[PDB]
């Protein structure tokens, strides 16, 4: 009946997939996700986490894809913006790098690789004083920065 | 995959170092970054340690700017050091890379030369007293900060970078964290004669043997109290050695009471240690101790002798031999009169190497050994324009009498060091005289190294061989003469022998056309080393449509 | 806004062939002033008579832009296109009324609404998203 039991199965399905990424097996991570899209096709986080896959293949063209397919079902979404920024910093091209993560930043202004970003595309222009501050104030969030985010408690009466 | 703190800080040090001047505030917010004193007790964790790394990466960039603030507090951490509180091991590590940095600043500014030696001199008398003399604690921590120090006494580089920086670039740096005794290798810094006589003090104190047999005693009790370490006599004895051969290795101007004394020390040890084993990593001492040994000799007679007495043990421990190789080398170089009695004593060995067969059943020393011998017979080239002759007629004679794979070997490599320097006339003379059996695959290769040394003479002799031994096509030799045209294409430097080596294989190859499409490749590489051609002589455009006359012909193209 | 978006399309006609960078600008405005929100009170957009000229100027463009053959992917397509529709949609949520406006400025509305139903008779075009 209720939707919740199916996303709290893709969420546990997710979050392992999310550790296996993190030691090095693609196999296995793909298959996980692949399990886990069977339910739900056509969510975010299984576009962003086939986009981190395709990434750590050591494919640098199917993770834009992607990246772009997340971005245009919810626009909120900060790490798929993240990433995309960053895969497009080292290709070459510094203007639509710049206005994404001036995007970023005026959806949000809590998070430090933002910041760490902002201040690596800066740093190819020229102003490194703004690029000085913006390590500064990316270290000095980070000091205070939790596992998780807090809103994940309800806020309930 | 240093992380994220670890990079963040760096990339922020690094940005910061390129702004002169520099503004004091962020310099200050550095600082409280950084760890602070409290009542002479440290303690430390990966975050401090870091940032502190940070600093010092960036004082090196940053010109020095605003050095009386950092280093005054750099010398706090050093002297405090033997009490800081700990939450291969990491303090060994911290220390080589402080006392690196260290090292580096004070070859910067001479100004602060005294003032750090000198605090160099009262951390060695605090460990010192240290050592002699609370078990726990020294034997997991101040050891090892000890021999992390030793690794890295003095060494640093006249480079335009700093040696600091090459260990953590910008994106090697991980074999120096994995070895034991790893370390790296104008001005020769005026250091006073009192701080030699103390370090020769310190080093005939620490190289005593019953303190080493307490060391061992102690961490036996710390054994069985219950770990990187096992044995320190070894180690420990390797270091010490190590760093006396590096610190002064490269020291000169002299008198000659500390080089003799230093010369009775080095054969003193050598006669105790080395003849005691004839029943692992002593080796590496011995044979530190033999290169520092010749650099103490001023005498021709003290030369004869060590030659003799190294050549004795030669025609019968691979460093050990490697090292004596290596300092016949230097004393024949440095001395040329005993060129023609230590000539013999090179040759007999490789024109004989039972131990070499045994391996056979590798080459590096080798070519180390034809390399000395070619340092050895240039030396005495310089000063005797006839010991070259008498060395070629010996040589002749023994080629008259698997040897003639090394003999070879040996006549390219002496041949390629005399490029420059009525020399090179009798080699080319034995070199044609010496053509005749698959021993002729190397020949040509020997050759082909020969044709760098742009010779117009020299070039029409190799390339009408090869045109004769094409046309007459020793069969099996078809694929080497095209690998070797193949390699001569990529290394000539003469355009003049450029386009003469084009046109002559343009010529060679319609000629032949009167089993053919393998000779498309080197022209492929010689042509695609050359900007696209627009106007020459006829002779060329003739030879070019000739050849795109017989491409057609054949349906290469197709 | 009844000159700005005749600019936009001359800029669009310009740009169509020499760039490929500009078609990703016109289509992330393009994205952003529409919603799928059918219903009473929430359409981001006015439901007067008196303001259909660049409502459906706005269409054809998208429309246009659709029909260009420039976005590489078979998924941008698809959600463009249920944007369009779910905007037309929108208009006929209220009770009819009358224009309120002179004799002028009403005949470039008729001929502006005859063009985008002519465009949207264009689609079939249709069998292969996926």
């Given at each position: ?16 997939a ?11 991570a ?15 986080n ?14 640098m ?17 900060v ?5 995309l ?8 091209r ?12 005026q959806?949000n ?9 902002l201040?690596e ?23 205070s920065s ?12 | ?21 520099a ?7 550095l600082?409280?970054?950084?760890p602070?004193d409290?009542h002479?007790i440290?303690?430390?964790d ?7 790394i940070?600093?010092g ?19 706090r951490?050093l ?12 303090a060994?590590?911290?220390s ?9 600043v004070?070859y ?5 030369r005294?003032?750090?030696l ?16 609370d ?12 021999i ?43 250091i ?21 047999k307490s ?11 219950n ?21 002064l290795?490269?020291?000169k ?11 009775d020390?080095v ?8 003849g005691?084993?004839?029943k ?6 011995n ?6 040994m010749?650099w ?10 060590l030659?003799?007495?190294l ?6 421990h691979?460093?050990?031999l ?30 004989i190497?039972?131990?070499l067969?045994?391996?056979?059943k ?28 008498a ?8 080629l ?5 794979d ?6 390219g490599?002496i ?20 053509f ?7 020949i ?5 190294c ?7 003479y020299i070039?029409?002799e ?5 045109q ?7 069969r ?19 355009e003049?022998?450029?386009?003469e080596?084009l046109?002559?294989l ?8 009167l ?23 006829p ?12 491409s ?5 193209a197709? | ?7 936009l ?7 169509k062939?020499?760039s490929?960078?500009q ?50 992917n ?5 959600v ?20 309120t ?7 470039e ?5 005859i063009?985008?139903?002519t ?12």
């Amino acid at each position: 009946g209720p939707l919740h039991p199916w996303m709290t199965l893709a969420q546990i399905w997710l979050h392992a997939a999310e550790v296996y990424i993190g030691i090095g097996k693609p196999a296995e991570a793909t298959a996980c996700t692949q399990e886990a899209a069977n339910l739900f096709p056509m969510s975010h986080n299984v576009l962003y986490m086939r986009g981190q896959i395709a990434e750590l293949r050591g494919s640098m063209d199917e993770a834009r894809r992607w990246y772009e397919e997340a971005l245009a079902i919810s626009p909120t979404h900060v790490k798929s913006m993240q990433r995309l920024a960053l895969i497009l910093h080292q290709l070459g091209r510094y203007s639509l790098a710049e206005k994404i993560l001036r995007d970023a930043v005026q959806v949000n202004s809590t998070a430090h690789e933002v910041w760490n970003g902002l201040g690596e595309v800066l740093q190819a222009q020229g102003n490194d004083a703004a690029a000085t501050e913006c390590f500064l104030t990316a270290l000095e969030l980070e000091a205070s920065s939790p596992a998780v985010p807090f809103t994940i408690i309800p806020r309930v009466l | 995959s240093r992380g994220f703190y670890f990079n963040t800080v760096l990339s922020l040090a690094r940005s910061l170092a390129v702004q002169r001047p520099a503004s004091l505030e962020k310099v200050q917010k550095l600082l409280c970054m950084c760890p602070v004193d409290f009542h002479g007790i440290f303690q430390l964790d990966e975050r401090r340690r870091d940032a502190v790394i940070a600093l010092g990466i960036f004082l090196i960039e940053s010109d020095l700017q605003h050095k009386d603030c950092v280093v005054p507090y750099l010398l706090r951490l050093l002297k405090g050091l033997p009490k800081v509180y700990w939450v291969l091991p990491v303090a060994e590590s911290f220390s080589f890379c402080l006392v690196t940095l260290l090292s580096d600043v004070a070859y910067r500014d001479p100004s602060l030369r005294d003032e750090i030696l000198e605090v160099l001199l009262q951390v060695l008398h605090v460990l010192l007293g240290m050592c002699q003399a609370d078990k726990e604690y020294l034997c997991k921590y101040a050891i090892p900060c000890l021999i992390g120090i030793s690794r890295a006494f003095g060494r640093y580089s006249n480079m335009e970078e700093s040696l600091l920086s090459k260990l953590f670039p910008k994106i090697e740096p991980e074999y120096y964290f994995s070895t034991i005794s790893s370390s790296f290798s104008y001005k020769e810094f005026n250091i006073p004669l009192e701080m030699l006589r103390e370090l020769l003090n310190l080093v005939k104190k620490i190289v005593e043997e019953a303190v080493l047999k307490s060391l061992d005693a102690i961490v036996a009790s710390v054994m069985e109290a219950n770990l990187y370490y096992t044995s320190f006599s070894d180690p420990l004895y390797l270091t010490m050695f190590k760093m006396l051969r590096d610190t002064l290795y490269y020291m000169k101007d002299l008198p000659t009471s500390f080089v003799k004394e230093i010369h009775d020390f080095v054969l003193e040890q050598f006669n105790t240690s080395q003849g005691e084993l004839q029943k692992k990593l002593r080796c590496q001492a011995n044979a530190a101790c033999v290169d520092l040994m010749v650099w103490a000799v001023k005498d021709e007679q003290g030369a004869e002798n060590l030659c003799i007495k190294l050549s004795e043990k030669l025609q019968s421990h691979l460093p050990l031999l490697i090292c004596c190789l290596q300092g016949l080398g230097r004393l024949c170089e440095r001395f040329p009169v005993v060129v023609h009695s230590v000539t013999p004593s090179l040759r007999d060995f490789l024109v004989i190497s039972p131990v070499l067969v045994k391996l056979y059943k590798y080459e590096q020393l080798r070519d180390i050994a034809i390399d000395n011998i070619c340092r050895c017979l240039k030396a005495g080239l310089t000063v005797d324009p006839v010991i070259v002759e008498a060395f070629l007629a010996s040589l002749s004679n023994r080629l008259y009498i698997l040897i003639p794979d090394h003999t070879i070997r040996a006549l390219g490599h002496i041949a390629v060091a005399l490029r420059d320097t009525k020399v090179m006339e009798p080699i080319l003379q034995i070199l044609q005289q010496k053509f005749c059996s698959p021993l002729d695959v190397l020949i040509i290769d020997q050759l082909g190294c020969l044709v760098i040394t742009g010779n117009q003479y020299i070039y029409q002799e190799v390339w009408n061989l090869f045109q004769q031994i094409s046309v007459k096509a020793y069969r099996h030799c078809s694929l080497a003469v095209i690998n070797a045209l193949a390699n001569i294409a990529a290394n000539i430097q003469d355009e003049h022998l450029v386009d003469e080596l084009l046109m002559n294989l343009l010529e060679l190859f319609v000629q032949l056309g009167l089993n053919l499409g393998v000779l498309i490749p080197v022209i492929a590489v010689l042509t695609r080393r050359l900007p696209p051609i627009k106007e020459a002589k006829p002779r060329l455009q003739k030879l070019f449509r000739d050849f795109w006359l017989y491409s057609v012909l054949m349906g290469f193209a197709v | 806004h009844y000159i700005w978006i005749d600019f936009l399309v001359q800029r669009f006609e310009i740009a169509k062939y020499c760039s490929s960078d500009q078609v990703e600008i016109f289509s992330s405005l393009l994205q952003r002033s529409m919603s799928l929100n059918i219903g009473g009170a929430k359409g981001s957009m006015n439901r007067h008579v008196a303001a259909i000229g660049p409502r459906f100027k706005l269409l054809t463009l998208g429309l246009s832009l659709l029909h260009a053959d420039v976005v590489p992917n078979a998924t941008i397509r698809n959600v463009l296109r249920e944007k369009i529709y779910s905007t037309a949609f929108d208009y006929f949520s209220c009770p009819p009324k009358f224009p309120t406006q002179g004799e002028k400025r009403l005949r470039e509305d008729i001929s502006i609404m005859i063009k985008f139903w002519t465009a949207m008779f264009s689609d079939k075009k249709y069998l292969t998203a996926s």
